[PDB]
Amino acid sequence: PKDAQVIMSILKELNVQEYEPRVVNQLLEFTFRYVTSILDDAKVYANHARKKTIDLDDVRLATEVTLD
Amino acid sequence: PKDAQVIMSILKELNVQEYEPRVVNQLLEFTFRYVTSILDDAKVYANHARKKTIDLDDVRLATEVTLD
Amino acid sequence: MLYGSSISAESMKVIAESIGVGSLSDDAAKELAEDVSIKLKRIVQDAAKFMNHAKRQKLSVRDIDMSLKV
Amino acid sequence: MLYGSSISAESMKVIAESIGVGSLSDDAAKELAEDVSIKLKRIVQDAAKFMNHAKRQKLSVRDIDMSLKV
Numbered sequence: 097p098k099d100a101q102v103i104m105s106i107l108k109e110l111n112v113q114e115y116e117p118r119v120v121n122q123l124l125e126f127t128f129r130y131v132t133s134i135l136d137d138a139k140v141y142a143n144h145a146r147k148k149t150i151d152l153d154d155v156r157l158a159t160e161v162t163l164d
Numbered sequence: 165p166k167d168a169q170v171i172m173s174i175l176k177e178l179n180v181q182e183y184e185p186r187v188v189n190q191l192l193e194f195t196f197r198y199v200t201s202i203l204d205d206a207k208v209y210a211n212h213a214r215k216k217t218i219d220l221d222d223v224r225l226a227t228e229v230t231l232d
Numbered sequence: 233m234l235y236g237s238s239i240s241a242e243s244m245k246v247i248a249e250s251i252g253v254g255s256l257s258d259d260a261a262k263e264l265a266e267d268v269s270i271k272l273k274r275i276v277q278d279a280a281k282f283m284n285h286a287k288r289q290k291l292s293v294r295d296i297d298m299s300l301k302v
Numbered sequence: 303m304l305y306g307s308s309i310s311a312e313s314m315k316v317i318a319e320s321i322g323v324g325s326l327s328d329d330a331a332k333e334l335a336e337d338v339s340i341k342l343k344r345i346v347q348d349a350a351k352f353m354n355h356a357k358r359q360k361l362s363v364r365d366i367d368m369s370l371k372v
């Protein structure tokens with residue numbers, strides 16, 4: 097709900113005044129997919145560094161290697 | 165030529181007695197694509213480690229993160 | 233950094249737990265929340281461009297799919 | 303490790319230069335040559351399975367494309 101609102105605000109801010117309701121759903125799914133993809137790689141880096149908590153450097157490398 | 169021969173030997177060893185000639189070309193292209201893909205990521209790891217030469221650990225991580 | 237709305241760093245934490253990757257440092261969650269918000273704005277922007285190119289005024293799931301392909 | 307034929311570690315070096323990533327350690331080139339050879343055998347094997355499933359005896363570029371998709 098909290099995230100759905102952010103997405104609705106982004107749509108309005110970018111001047112998308114009307115949209116099919118499911119666009120929000122699609123965007124929430126993308127959000128999940130993107131974050132999980134980056135975190136999944138970042139976890140490996142954290143592992144190889146022998147860390148328990150994913151850090152900025154892990155997220156930065158994951159993002160850099162999976163394009164930018 | 166050297167690599168084309170290896171590919172032809174693999175085809176024979178796996179009991180593929182007949183094949184369209186271009187299959188070899190396709191496989192050489194795959195070889196290039198796979199190696200370049202792994203090396204491209206491995207280079208980033210080598211960079212972040214402040215190394216000039218790609219090492220085993222770089223190739224292993226690149227391979228692990230781009231599936232396995 | 234970013235103008236307009238953005239996904240909270242807190243939401244990144246919830247997602248992290250749902251997939252079992254453990255805890256995220258605050259700076260890592262903030263970076264990800266910012267990055268995903270930037271991605272969301274790009275997806276919506278491109279989708280709206282597709283919509284308009286087609287002379288429509290209502291964004292469709294089809295416009296979003298096209299945008300995700302680019 | 304591997305039975306049958308395999309791409310040489312030397313070929314990995316040539317590829318590395320062609321893309322500008324610099325030199326490879328000998329162990330890195332050997333690992334890659336081994337890995338790509340394992341991949342090649344898998345691609346050919348799956349392609350031959352597709353070929354046979356279709357009751358053909360000559361491997362086609364189409365069988366290789368199908369295999370690369372899987």
Ligand SMILES: [Zn+2]
Nearest residue numbers: 140143144228
């Ligand atoms: Zn690992």
Ligand SMILES: [Zn+2]
Nearest residue numbers: 151152257259
């Ligand atoms: Zn940190």
Ligand SMILES: [Zn+2]
Nearest residue numbers: 145151153154
């Ligand atoms: Zn770290």
Ligand SMILES: [Zn+2]
Nearest residue numbers: 160208211212
């Ligand atoms: Zn970098």
Ligand SMILES: [Zn+2]
Nearest residue numbers: 219220327329
């Ligand atoms: Zn080494």
Ligand SMILES: [Zn+2]
Nearest residue numbers: 213219221222
């Ligand atoms: Zn190293």
Ligand SMILES: [Zn+2]
Nearest residue numbers: 156159263267
């Ligand atoms: Zn970032």
Ligand SMILES: [Zn+2]
Nearest residue numbers: 110111277280
């Ligand atoms: Zn616009």
Ligand SMILES: [Zn+2]
Nearest residue numbers: 116292293294
């Ligand atoms: Zn529609």
Ligand SMILES: [Zn+2]
Nearest residue numbers: 224227333337
């Ligand atoms: Zn390997």
Ligand SMILES: [Zn+2]
Nearest residue numbers: 178179347350
């Ligand atoms: Zn077989």
Ligand SMILES: [Zn+2]
Nearest residue numbers: 184362363364
């Ligand atoms: Zn054919």
